[PDB]
Amino acid sequence: GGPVPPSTALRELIEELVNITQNQKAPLCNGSMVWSINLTAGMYCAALESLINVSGCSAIEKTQRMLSGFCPHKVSAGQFSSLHVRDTKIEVAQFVKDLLLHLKKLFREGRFN
């Protein structure tokens, strides 16, 4: 019943993720690795759960919150008892970039939901 979807919402994830990924050679904060994203499906809660651990930056926090809004679950500070989070540790730099990868591919493909 309504015209095309909100395109502005796309430019948001595009410029934001492009900004974080378009950073100097130095990684995020201090190159603190984290549990690689799960671009497979529920990658939102993934990047949110790993990024939430960040402390002393507040630069990515924006992407964190915006990611939570979609995160199909709960993942904050100290709230895990499954022991199914440890898998592959990757540099926060490549981490963010990957986040931009899947995120842009989703919001762009139209399967952002």
Curated annotation (Swiss-Prot):
GO terms for MF: cytokine activity; interleukin-13 receptor binding
TM regions (residue ranges): none
Keywords: Cytokine, Disulfide bond, Glycoprotein, Secreted, Signal
Keyword ATP-binding: no
Main location per the UniProt record: secreted
Localization (cell): Secreted
The organism's place on the tree of life at top rank: Eukaryota
Glycosylation sites: N19, N30, N38, N53
Annotated GO CC locations: cytoplasm; external side of plasma membrane; extracellular region; extracellular space
GO biological process: cellular response to mechanical stimulus; immune response; inflammatory response; interleukin-13-mediated signaling pathway; macrophage activation; microglial cell activation; negative regulation of complement-dependent cytotoxicity; negative regulation of endothelial cell apoptotic process
Disulfide bridge partners, by residue number: C29-C57, C45-C71
Connected disease: Allergic rhinitis: A common disease with complex inheritance characterized by mucosal inflammation caused by allergen exposure.
Its biological purpose: Cytokine that plays important roles in allergic inflammation and immune response to parasite infection. Synergizes with IL2 in regulating interferon-gamma synthesis. Stimulates B-cell proliferation, and activation of eosinophils, basophils, and mast cells. Plays an important role in controlling IL33 activity by modulating the production of transmembrane and soluble forms of interleukin-1 receptor-like 1/IL1RL1.
Binding partners and assembly: Interacts with IL13RA2.
Family affiliation: Belongs to the IL-4/IL-13 family.
UniProt protein name: Interleukin-13
Segment of the intact protein contained: 35 to 146 of 146
